[PDB]
Amino acid sequence: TLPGSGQFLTTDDRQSPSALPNYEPTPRIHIPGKVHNLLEIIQVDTLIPMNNTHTKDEVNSYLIPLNANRQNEQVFGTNLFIGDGVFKTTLLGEIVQYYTHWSGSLRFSLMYTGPALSSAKLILAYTPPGARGPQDRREAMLGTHVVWDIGLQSTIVMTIPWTSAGFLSCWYQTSLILPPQVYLLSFISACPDFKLRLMKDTQ
Amino acid sequence: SETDVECFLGRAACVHVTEIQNLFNDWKINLSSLVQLRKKLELFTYVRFDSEYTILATASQLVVQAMYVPPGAPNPKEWDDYTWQSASNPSVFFKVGDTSRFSVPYVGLASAYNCFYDGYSQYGITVLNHMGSMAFRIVNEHDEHKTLVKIRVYHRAKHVEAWIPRAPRALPYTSIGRTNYPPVIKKRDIKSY
Amino acid sequence: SETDVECFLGRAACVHVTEIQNLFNDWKINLSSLVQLRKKLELFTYVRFDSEYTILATASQLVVQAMYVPPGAPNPKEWDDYTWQSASNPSVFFKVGDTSRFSVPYVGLASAYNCFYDGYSQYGITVLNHMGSMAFRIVNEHDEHKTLVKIRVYHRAKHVEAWIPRAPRALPYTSIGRTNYPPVIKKRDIKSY
Amino acid sequence: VQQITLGNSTITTVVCYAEWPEYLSVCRFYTLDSKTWTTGSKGWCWKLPDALKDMGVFGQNMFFHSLGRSGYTVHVQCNATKFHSGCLLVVVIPEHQLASHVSVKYTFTHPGERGIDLSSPVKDVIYNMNGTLLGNLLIFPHQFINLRTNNTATIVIPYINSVPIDSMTRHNNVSLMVIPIAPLTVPPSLPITVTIAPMCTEFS
Amino acid sequence: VQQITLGNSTITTVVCYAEWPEYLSVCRFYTLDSKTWTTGSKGWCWKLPDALKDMGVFGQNMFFHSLGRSGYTVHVQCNATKFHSGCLLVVVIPEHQLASHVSVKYTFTHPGERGIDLSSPVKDVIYNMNGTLLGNLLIFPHQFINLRTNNTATIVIPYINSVPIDSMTRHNNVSLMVIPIAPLTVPPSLPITVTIAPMCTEFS
Amino acid sequence: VQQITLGNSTITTVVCYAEWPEYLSVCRFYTLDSKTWTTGSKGWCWKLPDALKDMGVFGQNMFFHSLGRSGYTVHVQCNATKFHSGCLLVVVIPEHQLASHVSVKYTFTHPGERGIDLSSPVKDVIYNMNGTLLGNLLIFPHQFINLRTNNTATIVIPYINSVPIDSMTRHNNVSLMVIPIAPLTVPPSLPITVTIAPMCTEFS
Structure with missing residues (x-):
């Protein structure tokens, strides 16, 4: 017998004698919605509780408030820590916090729910890791951004570059023209290139 | 390959930590007692896997019988019951300090075990995810001193399959088999990075 | 064939000699604690090998749990912590007097471990050569006497590869992970044979 | 185009889990009581097939035969002008175990055509009736009804x-x-x- | 359709003299401060390439190299609902010699990103800053922005x-x-x- | 022959680990302050890419983008007549962990273009800043500059x-x-x- 014989290594998956070798279990049928890979379900976009400034959790916590008669102010702003803060309870931070290293591309989306008469221009500037997040509309517009006209197109989808932490700000280019409080809906998902390794256990 | 369900739910967890005397304990097989395994199981509605128990018996100051009681067999009521000797209850005899290992097939009645059941057959009392019961007894006789044999059962789900992904659980548990709950989203302002 | 790096660095060394009580010790895996292994490792800048631990537990006047804690998992703070039962921490159960044996893959973050890092991420504090941590506990319960189980861990580097040969170390060490030093060339005259 | 005809009834007008309802008669549009989305509404919950327990032949055959198996096509309509705003979240929850406001009594887990108005089991919308945040409920087959963008939402539920x-x-x-x-x-x-409208409705 | 992507930036959305900008890197959308068209506004004037003198790599390379040559694609957006009226006149004036409110000082002929608000060189809009009536300015490449008819105006200016x-x-x-x-x-x-957005930007 | 031209600059004039720098613009000759090899000099140490942290476009792009990857061609010149003697040892030390004169502070491990004059981390040349004798440092790519034999030394460092x-x-x-x-x-x-002169300089 070689060293380490008669030990029980919990990570050693071995075949074992069945205690009921004759019992034929009930046959397996095809139930719909099988998930083979967790990268199948992080592809689905889920709401971000971005308004953590609320003291209790409620559906309003999924709503980023936007206000009329605001130009050059900041709408929202977030870090990309996928284990604490605002992302810890989303589907991304709920599966990501089971592992240690998350190398993969993200798809970050927003949806405007205001009235059909309202319109606004928001700057979605993406600051990569290593720089300081913008604190005014000009540093953000001088960078990488998409000019999304909320009045025309109610939904924008932005592909965040491969990351393997960077900042994200929103600014009013023009004033919000109101009809004669509005809310923003933010969604997060993962691109199909999102790997996951060293599965851990939170305590 | 670490994100596959065969690897995510299929890791040996300790489903029960008991302590026997030289007397017995029965335990309904319920993997949802572990909030680390329960928090992984509740991201799916149905999950079907064959079971695999590795049982480690440790003394504290001998032979350990590990009996898997299938659905419908009577559980022991005394240490000297006739049910301990029933031929349909499989039992494994191993020494204290060693470890036992066996596998039980899919003993549910549906095509998968029911992690959640929206209805009545007791909203949570369902017989579809009942895998049976485990009884343990130190086979000895009037030993002049009592030695407490701590038993550590390690179950590993193999051939894991999952369906109907569910929302992840944010809050703790209060009961077994019921979703009854007693702010998880921590407060930051909203514009500050 | 004895000068190959698979044979020069790939020999089982005892990386830690501890003594437990019947209580625990955690230890950051650092092969550079051994000046015989450190003097061999510092002739190369980066070296990448899978690990292999053979653990010998000896009593002195039982079951020994050898848990490899991967990078990012919480270390135990009490002997009765919940972290001892975390399903992601692999643990091997073996008797005192016997020996355990397992292998851990390359758990560094770079393409090789960093034996030297010219910069900051603490000049020596780098997370690239962190292989995790080992915790050991004698699983027993209120045993009426305390028996000290000396544990001898033997690590053997396998699939050894090395780069950037460095100058051999002539002087002793003063700290862990730092090259800080406190005449090695012995005096003869220069013309005398 | 806009006149989906099903049986003897006619009405004027997102596949769940990409699995179309299919067999191993009663397929008609049942139009429930219209809900009033006030400014202070917290939500609605309809149970199936319990929501159709008294609706004609479907509800009768639900009680006559014990075992049955039916699929659905759910049309939720929030008719509005081009000045109205807001968005409703239509989600389908398989085996929606409720948390009580001890097990939850039968009269509320099986509320019938009226359903449970969450603005009146536990009615906390933030925890999905189970201690899970409402935002992580987006893994299920959904669609937003933005009166700016849309006015109808269709959810095809198979037998799960x-x-x-x-x-x-x-x-x-x-x-x-x-x-x-x-x-x-x-x-x-x-x-x-x-x-x-129940589709692919099976019985014993 | 409505997502003109230029470089690392992305925005959501009349060739001057029918001469496309062409050569004998820095092509990105610079979004200036949004102007407020009040009921009493008299006009705006942006100088190019002086309007881009401090905007990143374009404004830096404008000051580093003396000689340069750049074309532009100018998007002017007056976002509105279907109740708003009015029309803005976007004109491009080559070598717009201004008339003073003696020569005109440099701080106002080169106002940068802010430009000159004509409602505050001479600011009389009736004489085009030069003694010529505003109506005869229609010979230059223009487009009207009628919120009834349009909401965007695009002017492609070559290097003139x-x-x-x-x-x-x-x-x-x-x-x-x-x-x-x-x-x-x-x-x-x-x-x-x-x-x-500068296009076809050349340097020494 | 003797006029290696690189970019806009021109100058008048041993592959490390036999691995040529190669990709997975900014390639020009940066001429540092000339050092004075006195009779009592103990050595010089230049850190790369930290030695180029403020030198134009190379030093700017070093601070703008976080991740980068650059190779080098290092020319060290000790110009002399045919009466001068002496030899300098040019060595390249990968991951040169210094020993302090507790960790060594950032201002000295990252000294920039000036480097560390070892005649002023620990400055003991006998222990290679790490407790290893200077003579065993010859395993690294080196070349001796004997004014009797040579006057130039070129070291091609890849990205290590x-x-x-x-x-x-x-x-x-x-x-x-x-x-x-x-x-x-x-x-x-x-x-x-x-x-x-940085060669094969890469950025994010």
Whole structure:
């Protein structure tokens, strides 16, 4: 017998004698919605509780408030820590916090729910890791951004570059023209290139 | 390959930590007692896997019988019951300090075990995810001193399959088999990075 | 064939000699604690090998749990912590007097471990050569006497590869992970044979 | 185009889990009581097939035969002008175990055509009736109804259960819930008409 | 359709003299401060390339190299609902010699990103800053922005100069002006967002 | 022959680990302050890419992008007549962990273009800053500059690091050191001009 014989290594998956070798279990049928890979379900976009400034959790916590008669102010702003803060309870931070290293591309989306008469221009500037997040509309517009006209197109989808932490700000280019409080809906998902390794256990 | 369900739910967890005397304990097989395994199981509605128990018996100051009681067999009521000797209850005899290992097939009645059941057959009392019961007894006789044999059962789900992904659980548990709950989203302002 | 790096660095060394009580010790895996292994490792800048631990537990006047804690998992703070039962921490159960044996893959973050890092991420504090941590506990319960189980861990580097040969170390060490030093060339005259 | 005809009825007008309802008669549009989405509504929950327990031949055959198996096409309509705003979240929750406001009593887990108005089991919309945040409920088949963008939402639910046929009176396979995320802001009430048409309805 | 992507930036959305900008890197959308078209606005004037003198790599390379040569695609956006009226006149004036409110001082002929608000060189909109009536300014490449009809106006300006390359810091090749002809009547302010993207930008 | 031209610059004039720098613009000769090899000099140490942290476009792009990856061609010149003697040891030390004169502070491990004059971390040349004798440092790519035999030394350093790209501001990949083994004996000072040209410079 070689060293380490008669030990029980919990990570050693071995075949074992069945205690009921004759019992034929009930046959397996095809139930719909099988998930083979967790990268199948992080592809689905889920709401971000971005308004953590609320003291209790409620559906309003999924709503980023936007206000009329605001130009050059900041709408929202977030870090990309996928284990604490605002992302810890989303589907991304709920599966990501089971592992240690998350190398993969993200798809970050927003949806405007205001009235059909309202319109606004928001700057979605993406600051990569290593720089300081913008604190005014000009540093953000001088960078990488998409000019999304909320009045025309109610939904924008932005592909965040491969990351393997960077900042994200929103600014009013023009004033919000109101009809004669509005809310923003933010969604997060993962691109199909999102790997996951060293599965851990939170305590 | 670490994100596959065969690897995510299929890791040996300790489903029960008991302590026997030289007397017995029965335990309904319920993997949802572990909030680390329960928090992984509740991201799916149905999950079907064959079971695999590795049982480690440790003394504290001998032979350990590990009996898997299938659905419908009577559980022991005394240490000297006739049910301990029933031929349909499989039992494994191993020494204290060693470890036992066996596998039980899919003993549910549906095509998968029911992690959640929206209805009545007791909203949570369902017989579809009942895998049976485990009884343990130190086979000895009037030993002049009592030695407490701590038993550590390690179950590993193999051939894991999952369906109907569910929302992840944010809050703790209060009961077994019921979703009854007693702010998880921590407060930051909203514009500050 | 004895000068190959698979044979020069790939020999089982005892990386830690501890003594437990019947209580625990955690230890950051650092092969550079051994000046015989450190003097061999510092002739190369980066070296990448899978690990292999053979653990010998000896009593002195039982079951020994050898848990490899991967990078990012919480270390135990009490002997009765919940972290001892975390399903992601692999643990091997073996008797005192016997020996355990397992292998851990390359758990560094770079393409090789960093034996030297010219910069900051603490000049020596780098997370690239962190292989995790080992915790050991004698699983027993209120045993009426305390028996000290000396544990001898033997690590053997396998699939050894090395780069950037460095100058051999002539002087002793003063700290862990730092090259800080406190005449090695012995005096003869220069013309005398 | 806009006149989906099903049986003897006619009405004027997102596949769940990409699995179309299919066999191993009663397919008609049942139009429930229209809900009033006020400014202070917290949501609605319809249980299926329990929501159709008294609706004609479907509800009768639900009680006559014990085991049954039926699919659905759910039309949820929030008719509005081009000045109205707001968004409703229509989610389908398989085996929606409720948390009580001890087990939850039968009269509320099986509320019938009226369903449970969450603004009146536990009615906390933030925890999905189970201690899970409402935002992580987006893994299920959904669609947003933005009066800016849309006015109809269609959810095709297949038969999702662990037995091929089961007693429809003691177990709800799926539950339609409609939860208002952005509140209705209007220049103060708005009707919601939900019409449930069972498709691929099987019996013993 | 409506997502013109230029470089690392992305935005959501009349060739001057029918001469496309062409060579003898820095092509991105610069979104200036949005102007407020009030009921009493008299106009705006942006100088190019002076309007881009501090905007990142374009404004830096404008000051590093003396001679340069750049074309532009000018998007002027007056976002509005279907109740708003009014029309803005976007004209491009080559070598727009201004008339003083003696020569005109440098701080105002080269106003940068802010430009000159004509409602505050001479600011009389009736004489085009030069003694010529505003109505005869329609010979230049223009487009009307009628919120009834349109909401965007695009002006493609080529490099119009008498030397192949010239010092960009002392001479404005073209000047964008936006002059409100019909006043804004609404059931009392409306933003204008101007985004200038340099194209075919050349240097020494 | 003797006029290696690189970019807009022109100068008048041993592959490390036999691995040529190669990709997975900014390639020009940067001529540092000439060092004075006096009779009592103990050596010089240049950190790369930290030695180029403020030198134009190379030093700017070093601070703008976090991750970068660059190779080098290092020319070290000790111009002399045919009466001068002495030899300098040019060595390249990957991940040159210094020993302090507790960790060594950032201002000295990252000294920039000036480097560390070992005649002023620990400055003991006998222990290579790490407790290893200077003589065993010959395993690294070197060349002797004997004014009797040579006057130039060229060291081609590839990118030597464990990650394909890394933050250039917190980690020095390689360090050029020039240590005088035979002292300058002359019939009492001699300049050393070091010109570093980055090649195969990559960024994020």
